[PDB]
Amino acid sequence: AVQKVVVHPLVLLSVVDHFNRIGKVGNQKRVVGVLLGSWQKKVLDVSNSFAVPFDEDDKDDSVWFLDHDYLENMYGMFKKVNARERIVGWYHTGPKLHKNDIAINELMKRYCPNSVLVIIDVKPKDLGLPTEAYISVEEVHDDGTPTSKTFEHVTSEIGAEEAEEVGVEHLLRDIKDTTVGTLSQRITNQVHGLKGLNSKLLDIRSYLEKVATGKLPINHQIIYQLQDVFNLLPDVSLQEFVKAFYLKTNDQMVVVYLASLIRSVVALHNLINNKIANRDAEKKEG
């Protein structure tokens, strides 16, 4: 299977400019394109991407178009310029996935054996991490469903490359509060609490919503399973979890005595140098 996918900034900007391509027709069009990459390992690599023609109307909303010939000749171009590069999958704009978002993979499984998708968001209202990626597997159920063919998410991030470092890290010039040390992580320390909160808000909204609508949706397998997983691991016990706190005292201990000893001595030594060069230049100046 896949360990995780590694998305580079170039493909995300190659989605943003694609939305700028089709932003003039406006009327009813999602962004859909084709993903390029490199199957490196169990981890996955992504280098390039490009467009595709695609449309979808209102009545009988299963009307969808993937030009094979565009794929053939333009993949011939990209293979002609780079032989290291080959196809790994596809992408679209992804507000979410709708019902028709299986047929694209079910077309191009005959190109990549595991045709992986990428769900992004061109509108950065997402205070989470963009570039979601699914992969389609089968999980055939105890109820005797014949074949449930469900996309499943494998985790994702934004990777690094030496030239794209030069690119991105020059294109920002905007914000740098880090001074990387005890405080490059505290902004993200607000982020981890707040972005557990957003996900939990989605959780409670979903839980309240399943009782009202979906007719009896409630997830029927993975509600009671993973809910009891939740209800099996909030350890708040008090027998030796209290007794981790002399190890907490030990955590305090080392840093207290390192700070208290060496910080004062170094600052004092600098005071020595400052006051020597202060008075010995004072007697020569005045």
Partner 1 sequence: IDAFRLINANMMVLGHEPRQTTSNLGHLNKPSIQALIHGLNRHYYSITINYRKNELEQKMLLNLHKKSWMEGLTLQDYSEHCKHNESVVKEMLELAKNYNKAVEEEDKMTPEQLAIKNVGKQDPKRHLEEHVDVLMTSNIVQCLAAMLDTVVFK
Partner 2 sequence: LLKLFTTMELMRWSTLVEDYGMELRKGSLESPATDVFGSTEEGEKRWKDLKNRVVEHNIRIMAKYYTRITMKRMAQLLDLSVDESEAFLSNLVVNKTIFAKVDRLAGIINFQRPKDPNNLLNDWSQKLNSLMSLVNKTTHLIAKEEMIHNLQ
Partner 3 sequence: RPANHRQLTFEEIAKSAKITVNEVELLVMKALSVGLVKGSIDEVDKRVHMTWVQPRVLDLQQIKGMKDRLEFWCTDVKSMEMLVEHQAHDILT
Task: Count the neighbouring beta carbons within 10 Å of the beta carbon of residue 121.
Answer: 17
Look-up: residue for tokens 């089968």? 138
Element (H, E) at 198: helix 186-212
**Which of 4-12, 143-151, 189-197, 269-277 is the region at the interface with partner 3 (rule: CB under 8 A)?**
189-197
Binding residues vs partner 1 (CB under 8 A): 9, 12-13, 16, 122-124, 126-127, 129-131, 155-158, 168, 171-172, 174-175, 181-182, 185-186, 188-189, 191-193, 195-196, 199, 244, 247-248, 251-252, 254-255, 258-259, 262-263, 266, 269, 272-273, 276-277, 280
Backbone angles phi, psi at 200, to 5 degrees: -70, -30
Q: Which two tokens stand for residue 85?
A: 């590069």
**What string marks each residue from 128 to 167 as x (binds partner 2 by CB under 8 A) or -?**
------x---------------xxxx-x------------
Binding partner selected for residue 280 from partner 3, partner 1, partner 2, none, CB under the kind-specific 5 to 8 Å limit: partner 1
Candidate residues 106, 214, 252, 279; the one interacting with partner 2 per rule CB under 8 A = 214
We find the least distance from the C-beta atom of residue 31 to partner 1, in angstroms, to be: 14
Based on the shown chain and the rule CB under 8 A, indicate whether residue 187 belongs to the binding site for partner 3: yes
Binding partner selected for residue 228 from partner 1, partner 2, partner 3, none, CB under the kind-specific 5 to 8 Å limit: partner 3
Query: Which 201-220 positions form the footprint of partner 3 (CB under 8 A)?
Result: 201, 203-204, 207-208, 211, 218
Q: Which residues of 8-35 are buried (b: 16+ CB within 10 A; e: fewer)?
A: bbbbbebbeebbeeeeeeeeeebbbbbb
Query: Is the Cα dihedral 261, 264, 269, 270 positive or negative?
Result: positive
Residue type, 196: G
Look-up: residue for tokens 């005595």? 257
Query: Is the Cα dihedral 198, 199, 201, 205 positive or negative?
Result: positive
Between 53 and 124, name the residue whose CB sits nearer to partner 1.
124
Based on the shown chain and the rule CB under 8 A, indicate whether residue 26 belongs to the binding site for partner 3: no
Long-range contacts of 14-19 (CB under 8 A, 24+ apart): 14/48, 14/49, 14/50, 15/49, 15/91, 15/93, 15/120, 15/122, 16/122, 18/51, 19/93, 19/122
Instruction: State the residues that interact with partner 3 by CB under 8 A.
Output: 177, 183, 186-187, 189-190, 193-194, 196-197, 200-201, 203-204, 207-208, 211, 218, 223-225, 227-229, 231-232, 234
| Residues contributing to the site for partner 2 (CB under 8 A) | 96-99, 134, 150-153, 155, 199, 202-203, 206, 209, 213-215, 217, 219-220, 222, 226, 229-230, 233-235, 240-241, 243-244, 247
